Each structure stands twice: as structure tokens, then as C-alpha cells.
Design a protein around this ligand. Structure first.
Ligand code: 3E1
Ligand code: CL
Ligand code: CL
Ligand code: CL
Ligand code: CL
Ligand code: CL
Ligand code: CL
Ligand code: CL
Ligand code: CL
Ligand code: CL
Lengths: 114, 114, 114
């Protein structure tokens, strides 16, 4: 799985180990080994939510399976919780797009997962 | 909805009112409330279009509904126009991927829109 | 078609001409005209893969057609190869999400490909 967070908060706002926290929490949440989890955080972005340049974030979670209505709500609660606590971004200013990828459409190590 | 623009033009070439104009124009075109439109512009990127590096842009518009044949054609004309007018990016060096998101796959405020 | 590479490797480590290179190779691989191929490389990113911060990359290949079971296995072999050789990123630390786009959902030059 891979989780990407794009945000306008400054780099200094991202605590050391934040990437590791995301990795471990997502492993726990998705059930997949942390070793398969990739995380990417992009601060100091030029973005707005509702026209407002106050702190916000646009994210995406891609995963082969383990993506569904109820599961996504749980992921959102977890992820929004982390962003609020660690980056001080209000949950109502956070979007996370979820993607349930077919194993044939995810490349890794010279091949796919199909 | 959410609109992202990745471009190689210098940050100083991006008008300060661009995120606001994109927000207003997208509200106007999609019919979606502006308070829920998120916009993100990422300048100074290392990109190529057709193998060359003159100004170009790769974008994506994610929306729960309001995505389709005719709508996408109108958005493309609207957005290419704005990119040409404000960033001097030729329409022929712009790609816009449209995504009709299921509400269940859009996280926000500790939940989803479904 | 468009190919995007996000990596934590330094900008200085991205070889000169790498984008034009990718354009040519993707042209042959997909069979599409170079004029329609867009490439985007994002170095110096804050990311982790498997909880490790060693060189890694998260990539996307979007195309109208030319996406499938064996085609994606072949693209993976090729792209992981070029990344390994040119950016020195190990293939076990690279993910590539493949997207088969409907022509109606791809905007370009004030219109769509529908
Ligand atoms: C040796 C071994 O058992 N590894 C393992 C363990 C638990 C899993 O859930 C998967 C697993 C991993 C993926 N790979 C990705 C990227 O999700 C997909 C489906 C899976 O069941 C793989
Ligand atoms: Cl970190
Ligand atoms: Cl579910
Ligand atoms: Cl898929
Ligand atoms: Cl408002
Ligand atoms: Cl550069
Ligand atoms: Cl339509
Ligand atoms: Cl969706
Ligand atoms: Cl195939
Ligand atoms: Cl599509």
C-alpha cells in the first residue's frame, strides 16, 4: 500500500518519525506488513480548500484490497486523527482519495502482483 | 472536488490570485459549492511534454459526479484557457485526467462522503 | 500517456536527459507517439518504503489503452530497469500504479480524446 499527503503546512511542522508512525499505523489498520507500506509527505505546498490557504491536506491511499465503504471511514478517522495531532490540520480540511488497485495494475520489482 | 496542477513554470510566474480564480471557475463549471473545492498548484517541476521542456502541465480533477463526456470537454476548454491565460501554458502541452469518484472513496472529516 | 516518478533521490542524481530518455522508451513500449508522452520526475522527496528511507520511488503510468496483464508486467520490468540503472533505485523499492484511461476522461488541447 502507499499513502501520500500533500499539505501547505511547513516542513518544520512535520515531526521526526512521522513517516514511521504512518507506516506502522497503516500496517496495523490494513493488516499488511509494514515492509510493504510506502509513505510520502509533501509539505509547504501551494494549495487552498474552500478558497482558504489556511492549513489543509490532500491525500490518497492506494492498496490492493482492504478498501471499502466501512474500511475507508475507519481509515479516514485514523489518518485525520494523525494529521490533526501531528500536523495540526483540522479534519474538515482534509481530503483522502481511496484506491482499491487490481493486483495486475500495481507494478513492483520488475513485475506485477497478478 | 479536488483540482491539482503540476507545472514546470517558475513559482513567481503563478499569479497570487490563481488558486482563488480556479476555485471560483470550478464552482461555476461543476456546480459544486466553492467551500468544498480544493485546489493545488505545484510549480517549478522537472517535466517534459513531447520530449521538450517548454511550459507544460499535468492536472487532475477529482469529483463525486459532474464528470462525463460533455462536461469533461467543457472543463478542458475552461481549464486550458485559464492555464494559457495565467501561466502562458499552451493548451497543446496540457493533460487533464478526470476522475468520477465514488463518494465512499473520498475521505474527509474523519469519515467519507458515503 | 504520462509517467510520473516521485523519489527521495537528490535532484543532482537525476541524470541529464533522463526525461527525454523516458519519453523515447515509453514511446516504444506503449507504441504511442512521443508527441503525446508526458514525463514528470520529482526528486528530493520525503518518503519511506517499508519503513526505510533508502532510495525508493512511487510512480504512475496513465494511458488510453495499452494497459493490461502482460503489458503491465512488461512496463514494470522496463521502468524498474531504467530507474535502477539511471537513478540507482532498487526495484524492490519501487511501486508503479497503472491506469487505463477512457478517452472521455483525458483532457488535452481544449478538448478530450473522446
Ligand atoms: C511472505 C508473506 O506472506 N508476505 C505477505 C504477508 C501478508 C500479506 O497480506 C501479503 C500481501 C501483500 C500484498 N502486496 C501489496 C503491495 O499489498 C498484497 C496482498 C497480500 O496478501 C504478503
Ligand atoms: Cl519522518
Ligand atoms: Cl468495507
Ligand atoms: Cl485498478
Ligand atoms: Cl466560504
Ligand atoms: Cl530542475
Ligand atoms: Cl456529461
Ligand atoms: Cl472511486
Ligand atoms: Cl495485456
Ligand atoms: Cl477513466
Amino acid at each position: 500500500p502507499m499513502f501520500i499527503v500533500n499539505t501547505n503546512v511547513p516542513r518544520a511542522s512535520v515531526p521526526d518519525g512521522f513517516l514511521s508512525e504512518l507506516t506502522q499505523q497503516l500496517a496495523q489498520a490494513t493488516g499488511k506488513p509494514p515492509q510493504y507500506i510506502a509513505v510520502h509527505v509533501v509539505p509547504d505546498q501551494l494549495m487552498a480548500f474552500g478558497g482558504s490557504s489556511e492549513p489543509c491536506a490532500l491525500c490518497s491511499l492506494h492498496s490492493i484490497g482492504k478498501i471499502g465503504g466501512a474500511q475507508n471511514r475507519s481509515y479516514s478517522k485514523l489518518l485525520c486523527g494523525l494529521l490533526a495531532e501531528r500536523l495540526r490540520i483540522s479534519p474538515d480540511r482534509v481530503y483522502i482519495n481511496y484506491y482499491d488497485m487490481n493486483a495486475a495494475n500495481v507494478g513492483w520489482n520488475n513485475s506485477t502482483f497478478a
